[PDB]
Amino acid sequence: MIKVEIKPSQAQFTTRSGVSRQGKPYSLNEQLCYIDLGNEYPVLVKITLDEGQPAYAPGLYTVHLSSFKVGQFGSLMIDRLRLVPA
């Protein structure tokens, strides 16, 4: 299991916006977190949230299976990091 932490300072998201190739508006909400990748300290990672989802509250989390998909070359890829409480 991957250990993800949302620190007290990371409790908010920011929003970027724009227009798709054929005219549709979009909005993307982004939040930061720390992930332990086995180095001396956890590293900073950007998360893009799914539509209609609030920012994750401070605390410890792990990664949900729905984060992964098989890519166009047949290998596993991350789609979006989706988190669940630890």
CB of residue 13 to a second copy, shortest distance in Å: 14
For 31-35, the CB contacts below 8 A with 24+ separation are: 31/6, 31/55, 31/56, 33/4, 33/5, 33/6, 33/7, 33/61, 34/4, 34/5, 34/6, 34/7, 34/10, 35/2, 35/3, 35/4, 35/5
Smaller CB separation from a second copy, 6 or 81? 81
Smaller CB separation from a second copy, 58 or 69? 69
CB of residue 23 to a second copy, shortest distance in Å: 25
Q: Is 74 in the site for a second copy (CB under 8 A)?
A: yes
Considering only residues 21 through 40, tell me which ones interact with a second copy, judged by CB under 8 A.
Answer: 35-38
CB of residue 5 to a second copy, shortest distance in Å: 14
